Structure formats: structure tokens, C-alpha cells
Symmetry: C3
Subunit: 460 residues, 3 copies
């Protein structure tokens, strides 16, 4: 009797699971919204620099209208290699945002010290692959982490929250190219007998210099000990897989739960109802970047109800005005929603007007949600890259472009108002007195923004 | 000199062959129609219960318009596992019908006894995989089998015929969930020293209790002996394949012959001229289920010419009225054609009227074909699942739905007339006196049919 | 720590590289046009006979509108096997033209003798696979070879040039079915102690009879020695691949260079923006076969500037009149461009008129380019097969059909004018006095051409 090969089965549930972390795939938590949970872990925030500028260059004539295809290929080639290292070192990729990603090693509190060594080693190997003018910067944090899941009956979103989350962002932002930086708490919890560091001027964070293993040390054996504490590390018969999620079996209840996190146009491609090619594009869109600031953004039980309330109105007005939520994350200050008008299927003239009216509506509503202290929204319009970024086994739809960065910076440097760029202002069919021309601010990461405006709105 | 890997070649002929049994793929018989051949074998009829009800539930809002995708995935996950067991035990899957399938072990007469043991073991392992409220029922028969091939210059269809065929259906219909039932002849021919059974009240068929191997028995060694008699069992260099048909090589004469069995829209997908996704759908259709009854339905030489004659008119009127033959099989009483109006590409309003006029035409013509004793047709309209069901190496296009079952039951419980359901009646643009409202019958497998009607037709 | 499988990555650059030889993929030469380089090598020209006639037959009703699909499958099955042998013996496939291909073993001059033995062995094994009424004929040449690359800022084309190139064509044209013929120079350079031959009446070329290895000879060991001189032979960790090009890594500069050789509609399919199926078709087109003759067609430095100049005008007028360059090669006499009107996306009525006006324009312009001695153009219209031919790892878009051959023969047998077939003449919307009915010539490879015409043009 034969024992024939089992071909890998690439069921729709497995293709769905590529777009999600283990934290959600194996989370089995309540469908109630907001849902909050609490755990401990180590966070790694990896940023490739230089892709934002490459994006502008891939629009030029030299790429012969295959700029989107060439961009996603070279990006995925590099990002895939980082993803592989994260996964092989036992991490869970939570989200991709442009040319960056955020990874988590969730463990019980007593194992944080040893897992931090693992993550530092991972980071140093990652820094290694990049010895294309592209550099990698890495921020690490460790400690208490909260998770929020918010959404409605057909869509779900998650976020991680708390000091470790704020810390990992602060750390990555101080990093110079090729630095691995540790949060203050990460450095207080780490195995100091092995991690040689250098102080960072005016900061309590530190920079990793090198690993200094002791005499009998064997990283393989140590790693193996750490894998006792890693619930989903592929092992035994599945030690040849990058993710346990590759073995997920059809299960309609689980699939119903997981698909709510994934955009409809992505589900269409998963379902072989649309060609793979059409989601990689360089196309004119409007970014609407919404920031909600709270009194205490480390306190999920306070902020979760507010984010949910805001989300319920945001999703509804986006639907009216033809926009979509591409990504949500916690900033240094606030919960941000990266919203996009014009992407795969949704398109118009008056797209600009709609973006601005939608922004004002979100501003007016969210400003009155309990516990939201300040709302800020930046609106910018131009050619941006849209596509699936990452590795075959772990990837997400994301946007990359100078206008994405400009909207984010606008929302940060002009808090409490709705701002737009010049493309949006000039292009909109709105009268000029609905706007106010603003003082020009020098903005981290922005060469020349062009004139900027506040959308003051219809009256006053 | 290198000896590089040969990648599996997934030629169009191999993709075609997935839709057909070895009986046709390696049959090399005459292109004349009708063509009849005669052999012996063991039949297995496997029915999954519960999918029909799942179908109705996958239309509900909870599935978020991915009901067809979710249904076919969970169905294929389960059906694939049954297919694998059948193939590994040496069987040939003849056809899929909804959530059921029919498999054949063709052997010389002296080997029936030993092959029945093989098939019983297979069935018990199948019953095993299912220890989703889904149960499996299995009917087994053995003896003389006839095959009919009928068709025209561009389409071919096959059927198996005779007492063993009637028996395998009777056996499966007495089975309670999880039973394996043997036909009377199967039980008379089997190795009684090993097969422990229980009598079935008012029946000569029996139910399998267990296998009772004797002292020196080794199933592997026994199976190996049986494989001497199995012409296409994958072996040697190809022992890692589920089917020898996976090695089929391009051959335009053979492909021309085999494609005649496969629907045009399936050939389009095989040819990479249409996306895979679009054939899985939950869509409103009309089923027209035609039953032809004969004086002796076990006698191919009598019934073959009649089926061919009926087929020639059916295919032509279906073409006029935009219908298609989805499946043909022998019932307990008769040769049935499962015909569908509205599926992938063919669609209209007046679809209902056309279904009814086509049905009446088929009824009038077939009632006058020599040797057809009675024609019965059931017409029902609703949402039905349409898609490719089975395993990657062996699968077919089929339909599943409560309206498929209702049409089949109508045709059986109201013989000699054309009947329709209420959806079809109310929806048709035909005057009401073309119909007659019928007494309601309690019908095996039908909760509440709604009012039913006879299509009496234009005059009388 | 796991070491998971790396799945083959089928990046867009690798899919591009399938359409090109190693000569271009790893050539890294100047973007200047014309670019010429010089080397030595052995050429093999392999022709399958019989596919041209199969093409006409795959249009017949028996193929049930899947003639293109069936044709490309059976062709690729056979051609793939020839490709594999060429690659495993260390050759580089330069181009496919219909059911023929041309392969190169580039080596330093001192190694020509031993490499010729390798190529003869390859050819004898190829002749072996074909012991479908299809025969294979092989011509071999060896010596100095020039390469020309010509083109503009977005398209590139290459050619090989010189006596060895002329010789390999002459040799293949004398071959009877199943012959392997050596050019005079090939026979003068080969290892005569091992290659037994037969003279060819009125020719200095010879025919291979057999290999006569000496006593201690071991082909494997000898082959291994020869692989020292083969720059890209897959080896070590990559000894299981048919081409090193299968390992190519994303590199936007390299991809920008390589894509210029590949048709836009092919790049669309590579990019998963169009279904694979649609490029295999049997469709009515017009072939415009342009031949440029030079005083000395073995002298790249003379002819390269002329071909470039001609190309610059040809590409521009083709664009106006909706045609495309499908292939370019050196004939016995001249550089020929195989141009096609009507293929995937480009289509009209007046297609015929346009083909003829485009032809006349090319004729008038190219006749005045310095060093072009004579221009000849044949225009023929009918159903031709268009599709990707070859192996998964090495294939190209090409056309096959009796009308392709007829246009080529017209251009050769009626030099110095523009000729057309009867389909083109009758179909064109041009007045009859724009033409001249020509004497009928018996033409190598042409049963009955129908009446032929000179397109005399508007005036005289
Ligand atoms: N896809 C994306 N998702 C989120 N942010 C992005 C994306 N592309 C660019 N950016 C932002 O650009 C911002 C600039 O400031 P930061 O680097 O602190 O934070 C950065 C990101 O939030
Ligand atoms: N693993 C360690 N344990 C104790 N001290 C350390 C360790 N690694 C680095 N140091 C540092 O030795 C450093 C010398 O450089 P700094 O001035 O940056 O700050 C000093 C300490 O922070
Ligand atoms: N795809 C299908 N093909 C044939 N029959 C079907 C299908 N789906 C449901 N049924 C029928 O529903 C019928 C009800 O009665 P039986 O179970 O005896 O026979 C059953 C099948 O013939
Ligand atoms: N393999 C066998 N050989 C002989 N008798 C059998 C065998 N298996 C079961 N029996 C049964 O022993 C059974 C006791 O249960 P029943 O009353 O169902 O019917 C009786 C016989 O049919
Ligand atoms: N795709 C093709 N490319 C080039 N030539 C072709 C093709 N199909 C048929 N032919 C030609 O038919 C010609 C007839 O003469 P030759 O055999 O000398 O050269 C042959 C080829 O050039
Ligand atoms: N390898 C070889 N070395 C020398 N002579 C050869 C060799 N192979 C064949 N011959 C031939 O012996 C041949 C006898 O046949 P021909 O008349 O064709 O021409 C003669 C020579 O060309």
C-alpha cells in the first residue's frame, strides 16, 4: 500500500493567515468589541531606510511603466530576508507599515531576560544582511504589553498598547543607521553579563555594541532552552516550516473570524477571482492620516472604548466618502489611522473634496468622544506605492510614499486641526476661504512640503 | 553531466484527466455511440450527510458573501481525505454527485472475493476519519457491471449499469449513519471467514460489524497480492503518486477524446483563460431533473440505444433553452439527467419559462423513444452551490443544494409528469392554467417543499 | 534553531530571464547602440519538421476550438525535451524560431575541438529522442562569431553574425531528416580520431555517421574536463538546476536592461496582470517579412550601423501601422525581420492595407540606408499559431504557420520588391493598379502559393 506525497495545501484559510500574526491566528478570543488582553514580551521595531526615496524614483521614465512591479520585487526580496530571521528566531510579526515592521516575542515574565538575548542576536544578524542605498535601524523594548481588538460585525483591527510599545518607537527613532537600540526597561531587564552596550547622549536608552558570551556558552543550546517557552515554534515533523500557521486546516468558524482583518480586494485575490498583479501599483491617491491623542495612552481600559467609538464613526464616514483604513497603530502620541482614498476599485474626481469633507467630519465627531483629548488630521495627495509587502508566509497590504510621510508629519506638527498639502488644496473643488494658508514648519523627514493649509471648513 | 530535477508537468491532458476515472482515461474504446462493455467489479457508494443543510447556512449573512468559497474549502478538505483512501486502496473514482461519490474496483471474477476484503477495509478506515455535523454512509456491491458510453461528435458521457449498480444504491440508502452495508451478492461472494456482519431487518443486505483476520493474516502482504490484479496501481518509480494518470503525456488524439467529457467552462479554466475562482459560486439556478424508466434497466443492449436517442434530443433542446447536463446516473428506477439552467455564463430572466418549456419538450420526445416506459421530470429553482469538488488529482464539477434534492424527489414521487416548485411556478411568465396544483406528498428528505405543480402545458 | 526550506523564488527577473540566453543575461555590456562583440564558439541549429503542417490541421473542426492549446502543448512537450538536452550538455539557447532553435557553446579557441565532440554527442542524443510525423534535422558550425545588439532607449534586440552563422544555416538546409551535418570549418576543427563521417555530394560539409571513442575514453570524465571552460554550467549546490539563471536575484538595473528584449504583452503576463492562456492562439494575422542584404554580411562593424539605422525607422513605422517585430535573424543572405500585424491586443480591418503601406515605407527608407544593397519584403496573411514555445526555464514568443513560411520564401524568391499573397491583395482596400500580378515560381517548401503580386505602390 502506497504512502504518497501530501502536496502542501494552500487552502484559503492558510492564505488568510499569511496576513495575520500568531497573536490573532491562534488567539481564539471573544468577538466582543473592544476586547483587551494583557501579557509580557519583547518588541522589535525594524525600519529600512531609503525605500521612501526609491519610491519616487520608480515613477521615472527609466522604469518603463514597470515601476510598481520592480519596486515590490526589490522591496520584498529584502523584507523577506528580515522576515525569515525574525521567524527562525521565534518572533511573531505583528504588522508591516511601509518599509518597517514590528515583531513580538510574547513570553512569561521570568523568561524576558533570556528572550531579550535571543532578540538581540536576531537583530545583529538582521543588521548583518545589510552591511540600493538601504540601511536598517532597530529599536527593542520589553515589558508589559496590552492588546486591543476593535471593530464591528464584519471588520476587525488590533493594536498593541503601553509603555513598551511607546518605548520601542522612541528607541527606533533615536537609532542611527545600523544601530540596535534598547529601551531603558529592556536594558534593565536584559542579561548584562552578555550584552555589551554604549550610552546614548541625553538618553537612558542604550546602544548595542556586541554580544559577549561567556565561556561555556552555546547559542544553539541556549536557543533550544528558550523554545520551551515559545508556544508556536515549528517543531518535530513541522521543523521545516517557517510558521505553524502554514499547517492551518479549514475551519469555517476560524476563517470567518480571521477574514474580518483582511481587506475585501485581498480576499478577492485569495479567492482567485482577481489577478495577483493588480494590487501592486503606483497610483495617485489621497492619504488621510488621523491621530487621536489621549490623556493616558498606556491604559487600554481607558482608551479601548474610545478607539472603538471613534472607529465606528470613522468606518462609516470612510464608506460614504469612498476611503479605506489601510493601517492603525499607536504613535509616540496617540492612536493613528492611516486612511486612503483612490486605491484598487475606489476612484473618482472630487476624490480630493471627499477626502477633505470626510476628514472634517471625522475631526468634529472624534473631538467629542469621551477621553479623546485632541484630534489631528493630515491630508496629502500624490503618487504612492500600494501593494503586498513581506514574505510569502507573512505579508500585508501597505502603502509607501513621500505623501504618506508628509501626511503623518503634518498631523504631528500641526496638532488639533485638519491640514492639507498643496496638491489637495489646488485640486479640490472647494472655495479658497474654506482654507487658511499656514506658517511653514521645518519637519523631520520632509525636504520641501510646498505650501500647507488648514481646512477651516464651510463656516467662520 | 548534471541530472537535474524534472518538475511535475501539469500539462492540459493531465488536468483533463483529473475529471475522469481510469475507466475512461485508459479505456481506449471505440468512438461509436452507444458503446457498451462488460466486466466485473466491486462498487463503493460513499455519501457524506449534512452538506446539503450546510449549503443553505453558507448563504447567511455570517459568511459575509464568501459562502461559496468557505463551502467548497471545507467540503473539499473532507472529500479529499476520502478520495485519498479510495485511491491508496486501489479504487477508481467514477463520479462525484454532490457530497457523494461512486468508486469501482474492476477485477477478474476469481479475484472478487479478495478485493471485497480490500474494499471493506477501505470503507472502515473511511468511516474512521469521521468519528461540521457530518456523518458518512457506505454501500458496497459486487458482481457483473456494464458500462455505456453515449454522446455525439463533441460530447461524451458514461454510465455504469446492472444489478450491482442498483444494489450499491439500495445498500447505501438503507445505511444509517456510519454503517457500511453489503449487497446480498456482495455478502454471498465475500470472504466470510473474515468479515463479521449483522443482519438488517427485512433485508437480505447485511451490515459490517468488523474484520476478523485469521492468525497469520497480514493486511499489507495481502494487499500486495491483490495489487497483481490492479492494472493502474501506482508502483515502482511512480509509487509516490496517487494516480498513474498524473504521468499522462501529451497526446492530441487522446486529449481530443477525453475533453469531450468535460464542460467547456472547465476547459477554459484548464486552459488559463479564466480565473479559478469563478466556478465556485452560490447562485440562483433552475434544476431540471429528468428520469427515464425502462422495462429492464439492467440490460445495456436494450437501454443503451434508448439513452443515446434521448440524449441526442436532450442535448439539442438544452442548447436552445440555455441549459446544461451537469451529471447523469442510474437511479433505483431509471437513467437520470441532472440539468441546470442559469450556471457560469448562461443566464436570463425567462430562465424559468425556458426551463419549463425545455422540460415539456424533453417529456414529449422521450415518452415516444422505443423502450422508454415512463418519463418523469422535476423542476426546482433556488440558490445552489456550483463548483469543483474532490481532490486535486480527482475532482468534478457538481451542484449541491436543497433544490437539487427537491427536484430529484419530485421526479421520483410524481412519476410520468413534469412537476415544478413554487418558486418556478410564481416566477415563470406563463399563465396559471398551464399548471395544476398537486396534492402534497411527504417526501424522503424534504422538510417542506411549498406548494407543487404539474406543468400541464399549453393545451387541454 | 530551524533551517527551513527555501521555496524556489520565481521573481519577475527570473521569469524575464527565461526569455533570454546566458549571452544576454550575464553579458553586462554597454547600453550604446549598435554594440558589437566578438568571440568563438560552436553553433547548433535544430529544426523539427512537420509542425508547420500540423498547424494547419489544428484549425480543423476535430480540435473543437482548442487547436491552439493542443498545438502548443504537443509542441512544447517535444521542444522541452530538446531544450533539456542542450542545457544539460552545456549549451546556451540563443533563440527559437517556429519549430527550430539555435544554440551556442561559447568557448576559447583552444577548446573548440573538444567542445565540438560534446555538441556532436548532444546532437546524436537529440536525434535519438525522435526515432506526430516529426523528424529532426541538425546543422553544426564552429569558428569566429560576432554579436550585434541594436535598439533604442526602451527595446533591445540581438543577433549573431559571421561565417559560422551562415554555415550553420547552410548545414541544416542540406540535412535530410535525422541527419547531423557539420560545416566545412567544423569538420576541419573537430576531433577526427573520434568522429566518423560521410561525404555529402557536391558539398564540403559532411554528415555524421557515429562516434568512435578510443579505448580508454569515458564521456563523463571528458565532459567534466570540458565543464572547466563553461562559465555558467550549474554546479555544486546548484547542480540540480537546468540554468544558473534560475538563481538570479532581484536587481532593478539588470531587470531594466533585460526587460527591453521582451514584448510588452509577455511582461504583462509575467507581472500577473493577464491570464497565461491568452497568448496561445491560432489567429488571422499578416506577416511582413523584411530582408536587408549587404555587400558583406559577415562584417559586423559594417553591417551593425546599418541594421541599427534600419531598425530605428522600422520600429517607428510599425508603431504607426500597428505591427510588431516578432523575431530578427541573419539568413543565408541578409538580416531579416519577422514582423506581425494583428497579434494579442493590436487588431483592425485595414490591417491588410496598413501592412502593405508599412511595407512600402520600410522598403523606401531602408533602400537608402548606407550599406544596405537590396531590400526585399514578403507580405502574407492567414491563420497562424502565436505562443510561447520552449521549456519552462527557456522559452520565447514565436509564430508558426504556412503563411510565415510563404512570406519568407516570397522575400527570398522575389528580391528587391515588396510582394503579397492573394489573401492580402483581395482583402486590402487598395485599388488594383497599385499591384502587379507576378509570374508563379516554384518555391522550396510551398505547395501552392495562389497568385502572388508585387505591391507597386501609389504611383507609376
Ligand atoms: N504604511 C505606512 N504606515 C504607517 N506609517 C507610514 C507608512 N509609510 C510611511 N509612514 C509614516 O511616516 C512617519 C514619519 O514619522 P515616524 O518615522 O515617526 O513614523 C512614520 C510612519 O508612521
Ligand atoms: N553588560 C554590561 N555590564 C555592565 N556595564 C556595561 C555593560 N556593557 C556596557 N557597559 C558599559 O561600559 C560602558 C563604557 O561606555 P559607556 O560610557 O557608554 O557606559 C559604560 C557602561 O554602560
Ligand atoms: N449533484 C447531484 N447529483 C445527483 N444527485 C444529487 C446531487 N445533489 C443532490 N442529489 C440527489 O438528491 C437525491 C435524493 O434521493 P437519493 O438520496 O436516493 O438520490 C439523491 C441524489 O440523486
Ligand atoms: N463471517 C461470518 N460467517 C458466518 N456467520 C456470520 C459471519 N458474520 C456474522 N455471522 C452472523 O452471526 C450473526 C449473529 O447475528 P445475526 O443475528 O445478525 O446473524 C448472524 C450471522 O449472520
Ligand atoms: N517563427 C519563425 N521565425 C523565423 N522563420 C520562420 C518562422 N516560422 C517559419 N519560418 C521561416 O520559414 C523559412 C523557410 O525557409 P528556411 O527554412 O531557409 O527559413 C525558414 C524560416 O526563416
Ligand atoms: N574521423 C575520420 N578521419 C579520417 N577519415 C574519415 C573519418 N571519418 C570518416 N572518414 C571518411 O572515410 C570515408 C569513407 O566514406 P566517404 O567516401 O564519405 O569519405 C571518407 C572519409 O571522409
Amino acid at each position: 500500500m502506497n504512502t504518497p506525497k501530501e502536496e502542501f495545501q494552500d487552502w484559503p484559510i492558510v492564505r488568510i493567515a499569511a496576513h495575520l500574526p500568531d497573536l490573532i491566528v491562534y488567539g481564539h478570543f471573544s468577538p466582543e468589541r473592544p476586547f483587551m488582553d494583557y501579557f509580557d514580551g519583547v518588541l522589535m521595531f525594524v525600519d529600512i531606510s531609503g525605500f521612501t526615496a526609491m519610491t519616487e524614483k520608480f515613477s521615472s521614465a527609466m522604469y518603463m511603466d514597470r515601476g510598481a512591479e520592480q519596486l515590490v520585487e526589490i522591496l520584498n526580496y529584502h523584507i523577506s530576508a528580515i522576515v525569515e530571521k525574525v521567524l527562525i528566531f521565534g518572533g511573531d510579526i505583528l504588522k508591516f507599515a511601509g518599509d518597517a515592521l514590528l515583531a513580538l516575542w510574547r513570553v512569561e515574565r521570568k523568561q524576558l531576560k533570556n528572550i531579550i538575548t535571543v532578540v538581540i542576536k536576531c537583530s545583529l544578524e538582521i543588521h548583518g544582511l545589510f552591511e540600493l542605498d538601504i540601511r536598517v535601524k532597530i529599536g527593542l523594548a520589553a515589558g508589559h504589553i496590552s492588546m486591543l481588538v476593535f471593530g464591528d460585525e464584519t471588520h476587525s483591527h488590533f493594536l498593541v498598547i503601553g509603555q513598551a510599545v511607546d518605548d520601542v518607537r522612541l528607541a527606533q527613532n533615536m537609532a542611527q543607521m545600523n544601530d540596535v537600540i534598547l529601551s531603558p526597561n529592556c536594558w534593565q531587564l536584559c542579561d548584562r553579563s552578555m550584552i555589551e552596550i554604549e550610552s546614548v547622549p541625553d538618553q537612558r536608552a542604550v546602544k548595542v555594541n556586541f554580544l559577549k558570551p561567556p565561556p561555556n556558552f552555546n547559542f544553539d543550546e541556549f536557543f533550544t532552552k528558550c523554545t520551551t517557552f515559545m508556544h508556536y515554534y515549528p517543531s518535530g515533523e513541522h521543523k521545516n516550516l517557517l510558521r505553524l500557521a502554514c499547517t492551518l486546516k479549514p475551519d469555517p468558524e476560524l476563517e470567518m473570524s480571521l477574514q474580518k482583518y483582511v481587506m475585501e480586494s485581498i480576499l478577492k485575490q485569495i479567492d482567485n477571482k482577481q489577478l495577483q498583479g493588480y494590487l501592486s501599483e503606483l497610483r495617485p491617491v489621497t492619504i488621510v492620516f488621523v491621530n487621536l491623542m489621549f490623556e493616558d495612552q498606556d491604559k487600554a481600559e481607558e482608551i479601548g472604548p474610545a478607539i472603538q467609538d471613534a472607529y465606528m464613526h470613522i468606518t462609516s464616514v470612510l464608506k460614504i466618502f469612498q476611503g479605506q483604513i489601510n493601517k492603525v497603530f499607536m504613535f509616540d502620541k496617540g492612536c493613528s489611522f492611516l486612511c486612503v482614498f483612490g486605491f484598487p476599485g475606489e476612484k473618482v474626481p472630487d476624490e480630493l473634496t471627499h477626502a477633505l469633507e470626510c476628514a472634517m467630519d471625522i475631526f468634529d465627531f472624534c473631538s467629542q468622544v469621551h477621553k479623546i483629548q485632541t484630534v489631528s488630521i493630515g491630508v496629502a495627495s500624490g503618487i504612492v506605492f500600494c501593494g503586498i509587502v513581506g514574505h510569502t508566509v507573512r505579508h500585508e497590504y501597505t502603502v509607501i510614499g513621500q505623501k504618506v510621510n508628509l501626511a503623518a508629519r503634518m498631523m504631528m506638527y500641526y496638532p488639533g486641526i485638519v491640514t492639507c498639502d498643496s496638491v489637495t488644496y489646488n485640486g479640490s473643488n472647494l472655495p479658497a476661504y474654506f482654507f487658511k494658508e499656514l506658517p511653514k514648519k521645518v519637519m523631520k523627514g520632509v525636504a520641501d512640503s510646498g505650501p500647507l493649509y488648514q481646512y477651516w471648513g464651510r463656516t467662520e
